[PDB]
Amino acid sequence: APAGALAAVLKHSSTLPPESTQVRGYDFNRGVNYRALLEAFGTTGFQATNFGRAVQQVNAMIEKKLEPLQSRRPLTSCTIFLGYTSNLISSGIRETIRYLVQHNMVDVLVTTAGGVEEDLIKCLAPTYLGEFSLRGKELRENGINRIGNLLVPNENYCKFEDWLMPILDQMVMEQNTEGVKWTPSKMIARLGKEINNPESVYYWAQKNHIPVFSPALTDGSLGDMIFFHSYKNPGLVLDIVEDLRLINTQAIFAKCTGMIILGGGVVKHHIANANLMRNGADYAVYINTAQEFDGSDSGARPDEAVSWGXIRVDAQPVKVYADASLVFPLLVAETFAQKMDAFM
Amino acid sequence: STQVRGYDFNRGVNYRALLEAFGTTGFQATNFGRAVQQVNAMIEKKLEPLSQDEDQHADLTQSRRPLTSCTIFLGYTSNLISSGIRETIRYLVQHNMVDVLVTTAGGVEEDLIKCLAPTYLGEFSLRGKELRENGINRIGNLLVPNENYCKFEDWLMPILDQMVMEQNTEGVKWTPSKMIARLGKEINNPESVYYWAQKNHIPVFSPALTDGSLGDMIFFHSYKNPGLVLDIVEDLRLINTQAIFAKCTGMIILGGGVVKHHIANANLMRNGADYAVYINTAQEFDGSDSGARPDEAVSWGXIRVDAQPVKVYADASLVFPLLVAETFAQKMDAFM
Amino acid sequence: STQVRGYDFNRGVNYRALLEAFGTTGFQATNFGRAVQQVNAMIEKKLEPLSQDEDQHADLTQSRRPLTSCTIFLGYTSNLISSGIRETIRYLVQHNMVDVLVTTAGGVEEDLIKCLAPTYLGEFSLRGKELRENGINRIGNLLVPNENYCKFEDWLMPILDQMVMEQNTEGVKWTPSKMIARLGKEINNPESVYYWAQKNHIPVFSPALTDGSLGDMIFFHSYKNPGLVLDIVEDLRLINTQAIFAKCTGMIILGGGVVKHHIANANLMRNGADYAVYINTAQEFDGSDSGARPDEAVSWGXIRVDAQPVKVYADASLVFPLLVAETFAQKMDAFM
Amino acid sequence: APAGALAAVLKHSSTLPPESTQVRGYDFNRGVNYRALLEAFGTTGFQATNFGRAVQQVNAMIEKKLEPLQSRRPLTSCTIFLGYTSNLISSGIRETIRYLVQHNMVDVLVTTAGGVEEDLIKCLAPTYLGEFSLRGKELRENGINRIGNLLVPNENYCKFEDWLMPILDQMVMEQNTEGVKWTPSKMIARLGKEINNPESVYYWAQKNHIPVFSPALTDGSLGDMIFFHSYKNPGLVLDIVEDLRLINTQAIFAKCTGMIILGGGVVKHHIANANLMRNGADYAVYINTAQEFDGSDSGARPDEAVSWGXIRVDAQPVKVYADASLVFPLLVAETFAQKMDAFM
Ligand SMILES: NC(=O)c1ccc[n+]([C@@H]2O[C@H](COP(=O)([O-])OP(=O)(O)OC[C@H]3O[C@@H](n4cnc5c(N)ncnc54)[C@H](O)[C@@H]3O)[C@@H](O)[C@H]2O)c1
Ligand SMILES: NC(=O)c1ccc[n+]([C@@H]2O[C@H](COP(=O)([O-])OP(=O)(O)OC[C@H]3O[C@@H](n4cnc5c(N)ncnc54)[C@H](O)[C@@H]3O)[C@@H](O)[C@H]2O)c1
Ligand SMILES: NC(=O)c1ccc[n+]([C@@H]2O[C@H](COP(=O)([O-])OP(=O)(O)OC[C@H]3O[C@@H](n4cnc5c(N)ncnc54)[C@H](O)[C@@H]3O)[C@@H](O)[C@H]2O)c1
Ligand SMILES: NC(=O)c1ccc[n+]([C@@H]2O[C@H](COP(=O)([O-])OP(=O)(O)OC[C@H]3O[C@@H](n4cnc5c(N)ncnc54)[C@H](O)[C@@H]3O)[C@@H](O)[C@H]2O)c1
Helix, strand or coil: CCCCHHHHHCCCCCCCCCCCEECCCCCCCCCCCCHHHHHHHHHCCCCHHHHHHHHHHHHHHHHHHCCCCCCCCCCCCCCCEEEECCHHHHCHHHHHHHHHCCCCCCEEEEECCCHEEEHHHHHHCCEECCCCCCCCCCHCCCEEEECEEEEEEEHHHHHHHHHHHHHHHHHHHHHHCCCCCCHHHHHHHHHHHHHHCCCCCCCCHCCCCCCCCCCCCCCCHHHHHHCCCHHCCCCCCCCCCCHHHHHHHHHCCCEEEEEEEECHHHHHHHHHHHHHHHCCCEEEEEEECCCHHCCCCCCHEEEEEHHCCCECCCCCCCEEECCCCHHHHHHHCCCCCHHHHHCC | CCCCCCCCCCHHHCCHHHHHHHHHHCCHHHHHHHHHHHHHHHHHHHHHHCCCHHHHHHHCCCCCCCCCEEEEEEEHHHHHHHCCHHHHHHHHHHCCCCCEECCCCHHHHHHHHHHCCCECCCCCCCCCHHHHHHHHEEECCEECCCHHHHHHHHHHHHHHHHHHHHHHHCCCCCCHHHHHHHHHHCCCHHHHHHHHHHHHHEEEEEECCCCCCHHHHHHHHHHCCCCCEEEEEHHHHHHHHHHHHHCCEEEECCCHHHHHHHHHHHHHHCECCCCEEECCCCCHHCCCCCCHHHHHHHCCECCCCCCEEEECCCHHHHHHHHHHCCCHHHHHHHHH | CEEECCCCCCCCCCHHHHHHHHHCCHHHHHHHHHHHHHHHHHHHHHCCCCCCHHHHHHHCCCCCCCCCCEEEEEEHHHHHHCCHHHHHHHHHCCCCCCEEEEEEEHHHHHHHHHHCCCCCECCCCCCHHHHHCCCEEEECCCEEEEEHHHHHHHHHHHHHHHHHHHHHHHHCCCCCCHHHHHHHHHCCCCCCCCHHHHHCCEEEEEECCCCHHHHHHHHHHHHCCCCCCEEHHHHHHHHHHHHCCCCCCCEEECCCCHHHHHHHHHHHHCCCCCCCEEEECCCCHHHHHCCCCHHHHHCCCEEEECCCCEEEECCCCHHHHHHHHHHHHHHHHHHC | CCHHHHHHHHHCCCCCCCCCCCCCCCCCHHHHHHHHHHHHHHHHHHHHHHHHHHHHHHHHHHHHCCCCCCCCCCCCCCEEEEEHHHEEEEEEEHHHHHHHHHHCCCCCEECCCHHHHHHHCCCCCCCCCCCCCCCHHHHHHCCCCEEECCEEHHHHHHHHHHHHHHHHHHHHHHHHHCCCCCEEEEEEHHHHHHCCCCCCCCHHHHHHHCECCCCCCCCHHHHHHHHHHHHHHHCCEEEEHHHHHHHCCCCCHCCCCEEEECCCCCCHHHHHHHHHHCCCCCCEEEEECCCHCCCCCCCHHHHHHHHCCCCCCCCCCEEEECHHHHHHHHHHCCCCCHHHHHHC
């Protein structure tokens, strides 16, 4: 056999360090213990191992948050920023996020406009399961709107209009006669108070003094309603400058920050950019489906953010490459939900 | 019934024939050929004259842009301005080939910064710690020295001072669109997309203008000279009006996110765009708007039911200059 | 008409209820719930008794595996055997819950090597030059020291000698399936998938068995002891026969490539599989077979027209142990 | 303004080295020069820059191949391995590959079974354009098979059967009476000789003594035909061991190797594993759409192959993340097709 060939393939190797963890999956001959099954993801490899690392990172930021020490929310030992794209509020992850907000487990929310309005609309009418392959022409003819494999009847938006128009009237009157300078976070707090329904994420956020930022709040159905309303009752102004001040000072005056970001886009960048103002987040977990090759911010690995100063150089950020509708409930089950006693 | 056949290089390298053969090559090459046809259709419609009835309806805008037979919305993600696609977009704006621009904050600031300092080529693998120690920021396989932002601060802070003054003394109600026009006028540089946009009366929408370096500067400036207000409501009125009073609309959308949905949503106000070409790398399986196929937008009324939208699944830095070569650039004489 | 609703953690951490709620959560969580239902349907059908007529048709195989009411084909890519999913697959084979296995060469050799030396956790970012200098091979975020392959060579070379002898002296016509059964018998280790496969008469198909370390060893051995023949024609006959004489078939396919097409093509011989669950990360846009949706296979007759196939778009290292927990592992008592 | 904040965002930077290339796209004010347009991809960024690097890598392997110096193919100064997945032969890239083989510009082909049979079937009947969204039930009812957005009538396979069965008879007879030990490469050479049509990739490959490897040749329509034929005329054996010997010795005895791989799977690994036998390829270009996160070989970056010894440590491998149906014709236009004079 050719000597160079044998030397290439049968190269000698170095011994790995003794802390080296061996690959091994869960053994179902033990039966089905769901806690042991989830723990075994950490030694299974590929994204299962990243999930295991994400559990560890989240548990670290919770433990730090539970250490004793233009906002009335009290400082804790670690401020947790939670960001999520709109479509995740269309999904049942809405319930997962509501739970975290209800029990004051996170401190700052960031979402796009759909992620605001659809939480409110779900208190008036439900969203239904469908399929991705349904054809647009047939859905349009029957007054049904598709979001992935979910379906929202047009009627839902008519109900939202009827609910929202009197509130927009009051907001204009308060602006003009009580001096209120409206921003997205202030409007979202008001809407959560008005929906007055404990299934709503934003009801709990305003009850618990958790601010919600959404700088492009007009890009959605709420924007449509504001548009039509402005010809009936002109005058509403929505400033985004004050809200930049508010989010950035949440980071600047924190003892510690952690970021948990579901998806990409504005929600990811806006949280990360706030944490640059303190020379970076202490903890960071990304769960998203985007890839780096197209140079996008959405698809950028956590290590790109280290180069900017958005994540501290000493941090151990983790990305899980998966649909958050699969992963986030499992993550919550092994982290926040295990510490519910401590949060109350 | 068209047969699959690729370009035969025994014919020699005849570039125009090679590009034409994408249409019969299959997979995304065929979608590229269909995108060329759709964009040439937008352009042909744009060049048709307005009848007397049509010239009445459209004219209801008080837009000082001349009105045409097809309003073209161009949307692009911040990173594409970091790329050399900035030059591709500047060309289209310089020659009035598009009517409305939508981009995120990075897509505005990095055009201006490129007039002050250049962006450099690097690699995706470069480690963050080493780059941070040297003040080098990474954008994919591109590199922006932090000094670039230091020069931006020196140039912008005086303009922010004037804007606050004009607001408090002349009653100016600032919006992202108005600010972008002002910054384009101030850069006074023919390499800038926003210089040409303001010169040609092409409006630029960016509802989350605070999400980037421009935000950092406004934040810092707020401490020395407070009061700047940026209203997003008036800009919603403006973008929606551009679609409502159009005879025909076309959408050319590079990437996903806010830029894609905001253009599509404006076109829902007229019961849908007539033409639509998407070029993005996102996939539908996660339920995202970014990854949604054009047919999802048909269910909402954002694209007309009888339109023939096309999506090309590819990095726009490869596809978009070839698309422009085969469409707008072939009709340059018409736009002058 | 089912309403979207996620699991409510105010109920506490009730794992079975949490997994059940994926079905109404949306996007790929819902596809996971539909995959659970489809696999439970395969299992229910498998446990139904054969009638007298049915027990005649099926029995035409000379397979010594007992025949059941649903033949389940399990396919998986090499990398999943490098992962801890190896343990998941071993469980199913050990308890006779699947009937036919299809994997690539890596999926065979790495199971055997794991009985000699372990694979370790690492990270995708590790640089190749540094790893090569230390004789460490990278498989994604996993690490295999080259010494692992040195031990494999010592263990396999004597078996290759016997196989060539049996071919030349006893007329044995070797095929990938026959070789894999032999290697499983030789490893004699209850942690190995192929030890259990040979013990339970579960055939293993791998038409490109030469594409990996097993190939390297056969190549080197060929110089000292020439003549080994591995016929792939007989194995084609064998896999196709398993589908033709089945009362019902189901396909569970982890990943893409040869493993996906070869199972689907065997099922075309019976005018399509009755049940089908795909779990892979590939996308359709490039025209690949890996990325093709199940509905593409319906056009060929590889999946029956009235089947309800499901694809879950996810890394199988996350999804497959949860799927097994909610399906096969709940019926363990039936398979003993 | 907070001092730490200003220090975080307005950090001082180091000067880049003077060889640093500036980002700039093609300027259409120059008009439309397609050669200048393609050259400008190298300074455009993201995958356009990777395309520019791929042009350079391919031109380097061609230049080395053109230097003066169980196979009758003569050694050149650099052996070029070309691999491609089956679906690319269904596409019009079939013509691109044919051109390279026709003019002896590459030395070794590797493809899966579909990439063999569909080149032959296209000489009997064409493939047609369709759409990805066409429904399987309606296509099946009309006897049409879908490949991505392409369509192949069932009739095509009936024509292939009629053409192929007499050839399989002769192969069995030659095995049994002339001692021929059939392998995939030998069968593919014979099929290319029999199709006798200069539109066929494999006609040119056998005319020019370019071997074709396909170790899972049974996974396709050719396998179906071999299966049905074996009950009418039993006996055919197809050995894969001899073909492993043949591909690996192409690498071992090369002066220099380059790999150009379109897609992933068996085709990618099999070429790379052959080049491990010489301690790695000198040049490597990957064009594929797969991603690394799932631990797949398909999605692995070139740097993973450096760790195995499949790519030399001193090499400068490139991956372009794109559909090869877009990129490969452009790549060929700027590399092989510019040097056609030298190849004749
Ligand atoms: N429900 C809707 O989708 C909806 C409704 C109203 C308005 N809009 C508007 O559309 C715009 C764009 O939406 P966006 O900014 O929220 O993001 P997006 O949904 O458009 O996608 C951003 C990126 O997030 C990642 N991502 C998305 N969903 C994911 C998931 N389930 N798991 C993992 N990663 C995931 C993907 O990589 C995607 O490319 C917003 O301004 C929003 O207000 C959308
Ligand atoms: N240079 C920067 O990326 C930069 C700079 C400053 C601020 N930001 C902020 O980041 C936020 C998110 O950025 P964004 O919304 O502009 O987009 P993004 O980077 O989040 O991209 C959104 C989606 O567009 C698609 N896309 C991106 N690049 C593409 C390409 N090359 N070809 C095809 N499709 C492509 C991808 O599917 C991606 O998931 C914005 O608010 C923005 O201001 C980014
Ligand atoms: N460990 C190894 O990867 C290894 C070892 C030796 C030889 N090889 C050889 O490499 C060749 C190619 O490998 P292959 O065909 O087994 O597959 P592959 O690695 O080429 O994967 C094929 C496709 O399957 C899907 N897939 C992969 N991993 C997945 C996951 N974790 N979850 C979901 N989907 C996933 C992806 O879409 C991928 O593109 C084979 O001939 C094989 O023997 C590989
Ligand atoms: N035409 C067909 O698709 C066809 C026909 C007959 C049989 N088969 C059989 O199916 C099996 C699997 O096919 P395969 O191994 O060729 O690969 P594949 O098409 O199944 O995919 C392998 C990977 O290659 C990459 N890829 C595929 N097409 C690409 C493209 N256009 N551009 C860039 N990257 C691309 C993707 O990352 C994909 O995951 C083979 O054994 C083959 O014989 C398929």
